Amino acid sequence: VINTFDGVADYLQTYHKLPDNYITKSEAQALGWVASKGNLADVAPGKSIGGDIFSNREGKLPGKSGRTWREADINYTSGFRNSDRILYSSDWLIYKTTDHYQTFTKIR
């Protein structure tokens, strides 16, 4: 399973998709994930949430014509989700946040 900042960032730029231990929130919900119960590992062991579109409402990430931002959970293993996320654009800029989308720094 690939769920580290560097592992995932290198996978994305190379293969242009998340590794297969990732599922979107929608897919997780359909399998019985209840966010308030922290039960993702019980219903989808070894999976992490990732691949959903990120709004960039606060426009902290660099904007561009036709650029879409998505996110994925990093360092997740079980329980409630943590505050670590990788943010990647459709042109393969990779940013990280470790504080719940408050601050972002470039990592690729």
UniProtKB/Swiss-Prot annotation:
Chief location: secreted
EC id: 3.1.27.-
Lineage: Bacteria, Bacillati, Bacillota, Bacilli, Bacillales
GO molecular function: RNA binding; RNA endonuclease activity
Recorded family membership: Belongs to the ribonuclease N1/T1 family.
The protein's name: Ribonuclease
Active site positions: 71, 100
Keywords tagged on the record: Endonuclease, Genetically modified food, Hydrolase, Nuclease, Secreted, Signal
Cell compartment(s), UniProt: Secreted
Function: Hydrolyzes phosphodiester bonds in RNA, poly- and oligoribonucleotides resulting in 3'-nucleoside monophosphates via 2',3'-cyclophosphate intermediates.
Region of the whole protein represented: 50 to 157 of 157
Gene Ontology CC terms: extracellular region
Leading EC class: hydrolase
